Design a protein around this ligand. Structure first.
Ligand SMILES: CCCCCCCCCCCCCCCCCC(=O)OC[C@H](CO[C@@H]1O[C@H](CO[C@H]2O[C@H](CO)[C@H](O)[C@H](O)[C@H]2O)[C@H](O)[C@H](O)[C@H]1O)OC(=O)CCCCCCCCCCCCCCCCC
Ligand SMILES: CCCCCCCCCCCCCCCCCC(=O)OC[C@H](CO[C@@H]1O[C@H](CO[C@H]2O[C@H](CO)[C@H](O)[C@H](O)[C@H]2O)[C@H](O)[C@H](O)[C@H]1O)OC(=O)CCCCCCCCCCCCCCCCC
Ligand SMILES: CCCCCCCCCCCCCCCCCC(=O)OC[C@H](CO[C@@H]1O[C@H](CO[C@H]2O[C@H](CO)[C@H](O)[C@H](O)[C@H]2O)[C@H](O)[C@H](O)[C@H]1O)OC(=O)CCCCCCCCCCCCCCCCC
Ligand code: CLA
Ligand code: CLA
Ligand code: CLA
Ligand SMILES: CCCCCCCCCCCCCCCCCC(=O)OC[C@H](CO[C@@H]1O[C@H](CO)[C@H](O)[C@H](O)[C@H]1O)OC(=O)CCCCCCCCCCCCCCCCC
Ligand SMILES: CCCCCCCCCCCCCCCC(=O)OC[C@H](CO[C@@H]1O[C@H](CS(=O)(=O)O)[C@@H](O)[C@H](O)[C@H]1O)OC(=O)CCCCCCCCCCCCCCC
Ligand SMILES: CC1=C(/C=C/C(C)=C/C=C/C(C)=C/C=C/C=C(C)/C=C/C=C(C)/C=C/C2=C(C)CCCC2(C)C)C(C)(C)CCC1
Ligand SMILES: CC1=C(/C=C/C(C)=C/C=C/C(C)=C/C=C/C=C(C)/C=C/C=C(C)/C=C/C2=C(C)CCCC2(C)C)C(C)(C)CCC1
Ligand SMILES: CC1=C(/C=C/C(C)=C/C=C/C(C)=C/C=C/C=C(C)/C=C/C=C(C)/C=C/C2=C(C)CCCC2(C)C)C(C)(C)CCC1
Ligand code: OEX
Ligand SMILES: [Cl-]
Lengths: 30, 37, 336, 35, 37, 448, 56, 101, 33, 51, 230
């Protein structure tokens, strides 16, 4: 049972890393 | 590209929060008797 | 226009307006890392258990085989293979590849080739923006460290089984077996690297404190202090003379950097030189030049051996020498 | 397995030749500096 | 070992390997003499 | 002498002041070339001075004598020493000759002309002059093209070299028939570097090592003339950087790779680095254990073929993953070994079981018992066992000093590559000093 | 012979090729990438010149 | 502003976002079926088909693969009473990984 | 205390003295170093 | 010999009256000159349930 | 290859090719058993080489009819017995026998079934003595213990070495006894002059028992074999 709970939390962390790169808050200058 | 001109806003006033939270808890009182059997 | 098909292509790779820059290292970094990433995930989840030592007792490493995150690993290539190039096609069946330690040697060869070239495109973008190029030098300090635990150490031992597994508990066995055979804590290169990160963390906690403690008042107190800085500004966001003046009172005035360009060089040069020795440490320990050995060294008259702490660390090492690879050694020396 | 080994050699020598013929294509003039 | 007509010169030859290390130390001596101009 | 405010370079980056000074730089390489010869002479006489010619050479902590002894000076059959006078000569020859290089290194660095451009026109060079660089390249290619032939001539005319694959122990043999087949020579270069293949460390006989240098002797005498009469082609103008530091970093990329190969060749190759002189290799000393401890069953008479181990694999002899009769235990990883004390015991199907029970020479075990003891694993203060071994003996192998030193020496030059090859690329472009603060190229780009 | 293999890891075949289709794969891919580079050389500047590199 | 139940009618005007949503709903429906298949073949019991069959085991998406002709696993077992000669690329595990990619 | 170990250390004193002696003799007499 | 606080598992020993090891359950059953079947240790209970 | 086709090769000409995993095949010989010579002949270079490993698997399926299933080999090329030697006595009507005692008469081998799980054994025909006609040399041999007695588990247990800890099956049973196998030969072709005969065998032996922790399995082996006479 826990073998699928672990893989949720692994690919969950990889979810944010996708969203933190391409859907980041764009740094506007000045 | 262009900004979308279909941007709308969603709101939920307090008298609708109370119908929401009272909806969820009441049928959770209902069905939880059956989930545990 | 009149441009060729090829020139259209080279004005896209070297284009600095992509979201992630590719460059010419990235045309062979990206297909190697996506290879090595996508095979690391599968063998961390569904690899059948691997004979690591050649004695045909397979070691489990998958989450589907009753492991958790900590005990999961990608098990190294078997002892019987050694240093033979063992790709996927030399195995007869695909399951014969998996049982013999297949995906360890597929990952490491694509990983190490990937991180040699991630160092490459850190140069290449810095040439595309007019930056000075030496960030690629500073990334060579982990690259020197990761080349040693995967490639330079299995050469001197002669087999990819003694390399480091790709697991959290797999790493912790590699730290123990290493010091049992080579006594890494009594080697001055591991002493430099230990000072490389205890000094490196101190030089980050101390530098980062004083810049925070000299911020100029620009916001309110309900608003955070990070709102005083606006992006791309020209004027300086913290008083520099005040922090040298503070740290000059703290120990003495000669013990401080007033030149902030000389400061940030020292923060770069201290850990990077420190990791270089502890990368060369187990590189030289790969070719069996272990460390210090002060066993039975303090002897008085009448020929009697007094214990030191070095004889206590002996007993730890001697208790782990006779326990690693528990069903392998047929002979009273650990030459392999 | 021979069908797989002829495929890796097409893949590798494609990307190895984009590397070698990429740096030959006047990379040292692909800089933002001016003269 | 050394030849027998050369054996009274063994104490001098045991210094000779250390000499090139003293050339890099000389270059710091000379730069202190010019006082790091 | 030079200050800082005329050149910008500080006292610690001081040797970069003489980039554009041709004549001072010439004395700088000559003076440094003196110190290499001066180290060669001084360390040779030092090692002769502490040399006991009855103990083995690798036991006494020696690295420069087996280099001379491989060529075949003062050595006889089996590896023993006849006379130690030629080891005294080369230490004397380099040490006196270093002073001749020493005087020219002092002279051009002080009094000789600082730029030998307009006074001595054959020697004067500008770093962008491509035809002049290919000349100065092409002259030196003759100097180590000819230097390759000295090893060739000494192996075919001047007594030959020590051939450790001689029948009945190693012996000096004059190479008469050097293997010069191009398919045989160039088969090593395009061979894989992994186990069982061994890119150039696996050259196993003296006939190829001497046979190879006839190629490399001929090539950069042919290639040396090529660069004299030609300039680099316009694709090579589109590919390289043509400054002074750029030529250096090209070299530092080369001799970083040179160090890693000598790191590996002194650890694995017992043909150019014979085990009688440099000590056994790691794979040799591990395979010596199972052979000597199979003699220890022959004096007790138990069946070495039927000796099953604890895991059911074979205590003494087992099968290779390519199906060959090899040793067993944890030394199964070293089954790619070949050695002159072991190869007269191998048939088609690996080592022959019928031959090993009957046809063991006495001198083979006499050599394979020294190699059990003198395994290269030791400490840093020269204890010389496993890490759990007490202060008893005093031995660490010259193979372990050469593999560790020439890894680290051949590593920082790759860090030396990434320093200068970035700096020379930057300074040729213009922005080695920093960002201009008036038109930075980031402000002219689109966001994100 | 319970199964069929390459049997080609310790053989030391050059570039790892054992079937001559691999040599044409090694060479035919190389010539094609060269052919696209040689045509597109018209855009990469014409340094047919005395000295025209990234000099200093 | 909107209520909570009219939030998805920002899509009704422009065409282009309506593809983007209909792709997102299509990615979930397949990604269910890839997840439902891998979940179930990891809890399947191919031992006793005559008496502990496929339907009694309590199973949803695997008969819908079997009905169109998927009878072999990468594990090497079949349904009808034999083992796999070769599963091929289109097996229970492969179809499960077909929907997720 | 040997005669060999002593004359070795006498030999090391002379060379180490000869290093800065070239610097001293030009810092006083010439002034061009 | 009682278990100290630190060892999760402690090798069993049988000290004598005076504190010298007499019998034990060894690890290596191959070579053995102090195991209990070469000694013959018997257990007697006093009260409790095995009185 | 024949014998002297193998013997002409050097060690470099064979290393890594898998040629040394093979037994020598024979081309010149008598196919119809002409010779029928009697007496004592030195059974020399008796090496066999298997072809297929199929196990008597108690079926996944509930039907009580066992079978033999095809397997995937997990070891690379460690399966050929070699250099076993002895004497090959031959009679007059066809009564003959063979007795071998030495050489590599055992070789370890793991192998895999579908369903994922694995099964190991050591492939041995040691101390085998079959009599009879030149079609059947059916007899019996022994199977030694797979692991040794000094073998340790992952938890430091075992018969010759090891501490301990309902679970008394996992430490108190560390067996080092030898079971018994069944081997069938057949002579196929005889050479009269050079003294080298070939043939087809079929052998059967138990697999492994985890030192007495699961009931073992039995494995059919096919293949070819070879034997010289001088
Ligand atoms: C100031 C900063 C603060 C303090 C920092 C401390 C470090 C400073 C620098 C250290 C240098 C110390 C030199 C004196 C100590 C020493 O070593 O003294 C030891 C020796 C001589 O001492 C003698 O050393 C001998 C060494 O054994 C040798 O001889 C033995 C047989 O007698 C065996 O043959 C053995 O193989 C061989 O190694 C024996 O131990 C003798 O008992 C002992 O008296 O001096 C030598 O060698 C001197 C070394 C010369 C060669 C150095 C370069 C070597 C490059 C190869 C390694 C690559 C880099 C390391 C990679 C890891
Ligand atoms: C293309 C991809 C290249 C990747 C390099 C893999 C090298 C691994 C290796 O197996 O290398 C070993 C080889 C030698 O191979 C060995 O070659 C040996 C040949 O010896 C045989 O033949 C000999 C003949 O005398 C002897 O007789 C010997 O006893 C006999 O066994 C054996 O076959 C071994 O099995 C075989 O492994 O060395 C070499 O190829 C030297 C050249 C490569 C050196 C690389 C060292 C690591 C450098 C990594 C980068 C450094 C960090 C940089 C980051 C910044
Ligand atoms: C087991 C064995 C396995 C074997 C595997 C095979 C391994 C092979 C390894 C080869 C490694 C070599 C890599 C470096 C090559 C460098 C080429 C180069 O820098 O190249 C630079 C030069 C540039 O050439 C110059 O290019 C110029 C271009 O001018 C053009 O451009 C100019 C400005 O750019 C002007 O505009 C001008 O007007 C315009 O015409 C002119 O043409 C000049 O005349 C011309 O000399 O190119 C040249 O000389 C190139 C000369 C050599 C070419 C070699 C070709 C080999 C082909 C082999 C067969 C392949 C079959 C392919 C079939 C394909 C279909 C299936
Ligand atoms: C082996 C290494 C080496 C070599 C050959 C050189 C060589 C040189 N350096 Mg560099 N240098 C080095 C290392 C080296 N350096 C190091 C390690 C540093 C860092 C400290 C520097 C820092 C540095 C700076 C900052 C400068 C130089 C400069 C110079 C040049 C002139 C020196 C001078 O003014 O002489 C005058 C010096 C003296 C009179 C002192 C005495 C020196 C003598 C030669 C020593 C004799 C040694 C030996 C006993 C002689 C044996 C006798 C022989 C005939 C047999 C010269 C070409 C200068 C330059 O840029 O030139 C334009 C300069 O400004 N060097
Ligand atoms: C170490 C000495 C040295 C140095 C520094 C140089 C440096 C240079 N040479 Mg010279 N050269 C040398 C030795 C040297 N060469 C020798 C010994 C020869 C004789 C063979 C030549 C012949 C030569 C020619 C003919 C040319 C140069 C050129 C050049 C320039 C560009 C080279 C280049 O782009 O390489 C980058 C490297 C590559 C593009 C790939 C090279 C890889 C080669 C092909 C090795 C592969 C061989 C392989 C193992 C064989 C396979 C066998 C298999 C089928 C069994 C550069 C200035 C060129 C130039 O500018 O003209 C003046 C040029 O046309 N050189
Ligand atoms: C093909 C199916 C489909 C589609 C595309 C639409 C599309 C639309 N409907 Mg309609 N609708 C449908 C089926 C559909 N409906 C059905 C079957 C019913 C009967 C129950 C309704 C009843 C209905 C009403 C009464 C209203 C809409 C409205 C809307 C609009 C906005 C929806 C919204 O804001 O929801 C927002 C939804 C949420 C914020 C979350 C709701 C949470 C749900 C109730 C439970 C969670 C989802 C569940 C777990 C997913 C399982 C899916 C199931 C199929 C298995 C949009 C035009 C609104 C409209 O037209 O006003 C302009 C409106 O008032 N729909
Ligand atoms: C830091 C520097 C360290 C030292 C560097 C120098 C030593 C390393 C290189 C060794 C020699 C490599 C020459 C070719 C060897 C060879 O062909 O083996 C061929 C090898 C192995 O080939 C194998 O051979 C075996 C024996 O026959 C089997 O047959 C296998 O099937 C076969 O795959 O292939 C590789 O290792 C991968 C090559 C891909 C290289 C990618 C890097 C390219 C980066 C850009 C380069 C720009 C220029
Ligand atoms: C390998 C993958 C493995 C599975 C992945 C699972 C991921 C789980 C974790 C997700 C983390 C989400 C954190 C918040 C993200 C965020 O704030 O984005 C903020 C962005 C703002 O972008 C904005 O978009 C604007 C354009 S517009 O207005 O939207 O048209 C633009 O103006 C602005 O600049 C831009 O910033 O919002 C969006 O535009 C996209 C909507 C994001 C919200 C949905 C995320 C949840 C669904 C994920 C997929 C299903 C997963 C199932 C569980 C939910
Ligand atoms: C430029 C410069 C520099 C450098 C310099 C140099 C580096 C020099 C070198 C020099 C050299 C490099 C020198 C050498 C010399 C040598 C000699 C002088 C030798 C002698 C010898 C002898 C004397 C011998 C003797 C003997 C014999 C005969 C035999 C045995 C015994 C005996 C030992 C006795 C520097 C850095 C400072 C910086 C500044 C400037
Ligand atoms: C004597 C001897 C021998 C031989 C040897 C030889 C013969 C060698 C040769 C060698 C060679 C013949 C080598 C070659 C090499 C090459 C190389 C190494 C190359 C490189 C390249 C480069 C570096 C390039 C780069 C680039 C690119 C990539 C792109 C663009 C840019 C540039 C151009 C920069 C033998 C083994 C027999 C034995 C032992 C000893
Ligand atoms: C409440 C409830 C309900 C509902 C339910 C539902 C609705 C469910 C769903 C579920 C789902 C809907 C799930 C899904 C999942 C998905 C997934 C799991 C996916 C994944 C994917 C991935 C992971 C991908 C990845 C990637 C990318 C992104 C890139 C490209 C490539 C790759 C492949 C890597 C009902 C009423 C009916 C009843 C019961 C209860
Ligand atoms: O593989 Mn991982 O650790 Ca180099 O020692 Mn012998 O082998 Mn094994 O034991 Mn100790
Ligand atoms: Cl072993």
């Amino acid at each position: 049972m826990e073998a699928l709970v672990y893989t949720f939390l692994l690919v969950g962390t990889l979810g944010i890393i996708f969203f933190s790169i391409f859907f980041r808050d764009p740094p506007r200058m000045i | 590209a262009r900004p979308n001109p279909n941007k709308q806003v969603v709101e939920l006033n307090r008298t609708s929060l109370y119908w929401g939270l009272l909806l969820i808890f009441v049928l959770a009182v209902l069905f939880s008797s059956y989930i545990f059997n | 226009e009149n441009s060729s098909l090829w020139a259209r292509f080279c004005e896209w790779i070297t284009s600095t307006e992509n979201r992630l820059y590719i460059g010419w290292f990235g045309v062979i970094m990206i297909p190697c890392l996506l290879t090595a990433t996508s095979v690391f995930i599968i063998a961390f989840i569904a690899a059948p258990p691997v004979d690591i030592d050649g004695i045909r007792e397979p070691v489990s490493g998958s989450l589907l085989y009753g492991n958790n995150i900590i005990t999961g690993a990608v098990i190294p290539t078997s002892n019987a293979i050694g240093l033979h190039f063992y790709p996927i096609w030399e195995a007869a069946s695909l399951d014969e590849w998996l049982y013999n330690g297949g995906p360890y040697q597929l990952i490491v060869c694509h990983f190490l080739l990937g991180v040699y070239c991630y160092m490459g495109r850190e140069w290449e973008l810095s040439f595309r923006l007019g930056m000075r190029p030496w960030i690629a030098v500073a990334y060579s300090a982990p690259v020197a460290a990761a080349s040693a635990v995967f490639l330079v150490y299995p050469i001197g031992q002669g087999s990819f089984s003694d390399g480091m597994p790709l697991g959290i508990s797999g790493t912790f066995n590699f730290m123990i077996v290493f010091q049992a055979e080579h006594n890494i804590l009594m080697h001055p290169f591991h002493m430099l690297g230990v000072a490389g990160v205890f000094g490196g963390s101190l030089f980050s906690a101390m530098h980062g404190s004083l810049v925070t403690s000299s911020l100029i008042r620009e916001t309110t107190e309900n608003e955070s202090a990070n709102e005083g800085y606006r992006f791309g500004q020209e004027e300086e966001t913290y008083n520099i003379v005040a922090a040298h003046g503070y740290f000059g009172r703290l120990i003495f005035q000669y013990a401080s950097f007033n030149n902030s360009r000389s400061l940030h060089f020292f923060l770069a040069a201290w850990p990077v030189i420190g990791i270089w020795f502890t990368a060369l440490g187990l590189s030289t320990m790969a070719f069996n030049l272990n460390g210090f050995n002060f066993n039975q060294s303090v002897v008085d008259s009448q020929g009697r051996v007094l214990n030191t702490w070095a004889d206590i660390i002996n007993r730890a090492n001697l208790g782990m020498e006779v326990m690693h690879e528990r069903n392998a050694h047929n002979f009273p020396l650990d030459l392999a | 397995m021979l069908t797989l080994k002829i495929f890796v050699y097409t893949v590798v020598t494609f990307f190895v030749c984009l590397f070698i013929f990429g740096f030959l294509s006047n990379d040292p003039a692909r800089n933002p500096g001016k003269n | 070992k050394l030849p027998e007509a050369y054996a009274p010169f063994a104490p001098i030859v045991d210094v000779l390997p250390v000499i090139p290390v003293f050339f890099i130390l000389l270059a710091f001596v000379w730069q202190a003499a010019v006082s790091f101009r | 002498g030079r200050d800082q405010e005329t050149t910008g370079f500080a006292w610690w980056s001081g040797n970069a002041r003489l980039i554009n000074l041709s004549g001072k730089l010439l004395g700088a390489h000559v003076a440094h070339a003196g110190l290499i010869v001066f180290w060669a002479g001084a360390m040779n006489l030092f090692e002769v001075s502490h040399f006991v010619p009855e103990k083995p050479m690798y036991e006494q902590g020696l690295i420069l004598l087996p280099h001379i002894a491989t060529l075949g000076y003062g050595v006889g059959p089996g590896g023993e020493i006849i006379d130690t006078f030629p080891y005294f000569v080369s230490g004397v020859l380099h040490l006196i000759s270093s002073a001749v290089l020493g005087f020219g290194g002092v002279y051009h660095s002080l009094i000789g002309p600082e730029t030998l451009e307009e006074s001595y026109p054959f020697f004067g060079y500008v770093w962008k002059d491509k035809n002049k660089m290919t000349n100065i390249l092409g002259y030196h290619l003759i100097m180590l093209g000819l230097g390759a032939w000295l090893l060739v001539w000494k192996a075919m005319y001047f007594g030959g070299v020590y051939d450790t694959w001689a029948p009945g122990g190693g012996d000096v043999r004059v190479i008469t028939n050097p293997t010069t087949n191009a398919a045989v020579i160039f088969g090593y270069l395009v061979k894989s570097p992994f186990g069982g293949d061994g890119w150039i460390c696996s050259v196993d006989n003296m006939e190829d090592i001497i046979g190879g240098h006839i190629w490399i002797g001929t090539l950069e005498i042919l290639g040396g003339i090529w660069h004299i009469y030609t300039t680099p082609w316009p694709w090579a103008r589109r590919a390289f950087v043509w400054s002074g530091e750029a030529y250096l970093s090209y070299s530092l990329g080369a001799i970083g790779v040179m160090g890693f190969i000598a790191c590996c060749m002194s650890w694995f190759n017992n043909t150019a680095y014979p085990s009688e002189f440099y000590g056994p290799t790691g794979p040799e000393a591990s395979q010596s254990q199972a052979f000597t401890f199979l003699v220890r069953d022959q004096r007790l008479g138990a069946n070495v073929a039927s000796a099953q181990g604890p895991t059911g694999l074979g205590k003494y002899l087992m099968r290779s993953p390519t199906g060959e009769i090899i040793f067993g235990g944890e030394t199964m990883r070293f089954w790619d070994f070949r050695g002159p004390w072991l190869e007269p015991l191998r048939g088609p199907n690996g080592l022959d079981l019928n031959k090993l029970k009957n046809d063991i020479q006495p001198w083979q075990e006499r050599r394979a018992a020294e190699y059990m003891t003198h395994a290269p694993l030791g400490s840093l203060n020269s204890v010389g066992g496993v890490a759990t071994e007490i202060n008893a003996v005093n031995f660490v192998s010259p193979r372990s000093w050469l593999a560790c030193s020439h890894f680290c020496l051949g590593f920082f030059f790759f860090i030396g590559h990434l320093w200068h090859a970035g700096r020379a690329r930057a300074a040729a472009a213009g922005f080695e000093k920093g960002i201009d603060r008036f038109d930075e190229p980031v402000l002219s780009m689109r966001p994100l | 012979l319970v199964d069929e293999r390459m049997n080609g890891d310790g053989t030391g075949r050059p570039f790892g090729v054992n079937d001559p289709v691999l040599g044409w794969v090694l060479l035919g891919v190389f010539g094609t990438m060269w052919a696209i580079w040689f045509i597109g050389q018209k855009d990469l500047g014409d340094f047919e010149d005395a000295d025209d590199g990234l000099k200093l | 502003g909107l209520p909570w139940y009219r939030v998805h009618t920002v899509v009704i005007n422009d065409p282009g976002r309506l593809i983007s949503v209909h792709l997102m709903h299509t990615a979930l429906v397949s990604g269910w079926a890839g997840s439902m298949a891998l979940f179930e073949i990891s809890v399947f019991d191919p031992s006793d088909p005559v008496l502990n069959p496929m339907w009694r085991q309590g199973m949803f998406v695997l008969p819908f693969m079997t009905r169109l002709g998927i009878t072999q696993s990468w594990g090497g077992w079949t349904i009808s009473g034999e083992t796999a000669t070769n599963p091929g690329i289109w097996s229970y595990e492969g179809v499960a990984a077909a929907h997720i990619i | 205390m040997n005669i060999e170990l002593a004359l070795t250390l006498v030999s090391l004193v002379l060379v180490v003295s000869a290093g800065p002696l070239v610097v001293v003799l030009l810092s006083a007499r010439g002034g061009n170093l | 010999r009682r278990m100290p606080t630190f060892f999760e598992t402690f090798p069993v020993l049988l000290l004598d009256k005076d504190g010298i090891v007499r019998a034990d359950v060894p690890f290596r059953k191959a070579e053995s000159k102090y195991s209990i079947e070469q000694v013959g240790v018997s257990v007697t209970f006093y009260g409790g349930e095995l009185d | 290859l024949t014998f002297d086709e193998i013997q002409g090769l050097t060690y470099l000409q064979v290393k890594g090719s898998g040629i040394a995993n093979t037994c020598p095949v024979l081309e010149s010989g008598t196919t119809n058993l002409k010779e029928l010579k009697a007496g004592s002949y030195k059974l020399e270079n008796f090496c066999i080489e298997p072809t297929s490993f199929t196990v008597k698997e108690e079926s996944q399926f509930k039907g009580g009819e066992t079978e033999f299933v095809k397997t995937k080999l997990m070891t690379r090329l460690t399966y050929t017995l070699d250099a076993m030697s002895g004497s090959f006595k031959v009679g007059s009507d066809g009564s003959a026998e063979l007795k071998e005692d030495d050489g590599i008469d055992y070789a370890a081998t793991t192998v895999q079934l579908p369903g994922g799980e694995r099964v190991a054994f050591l492939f041995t025909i040691k101390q085998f003595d079959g009599k009879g006609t030149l079609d059947g040399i059916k007899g019996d041999f022994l199977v030694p213990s797979y692991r040794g007695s000094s073998f340790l588990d992952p938890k430091g247990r075992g018969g010759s070495t090891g501490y301990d800890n309902e679970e008394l099956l996992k430490e108190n049973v560390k067996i080092t006894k030898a079971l018994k196998g069944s081997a069938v030969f057949s002579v196929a072709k005889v050479d009269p002059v050079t003294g080298e005969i070939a043939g087809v065998f079929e052998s059967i032996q138990p697999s492994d028992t985890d030192l007495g922790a699961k009931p073992p399995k039995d494995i059919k082996v096919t293949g070819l074999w070879y034997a010289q006479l001088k």
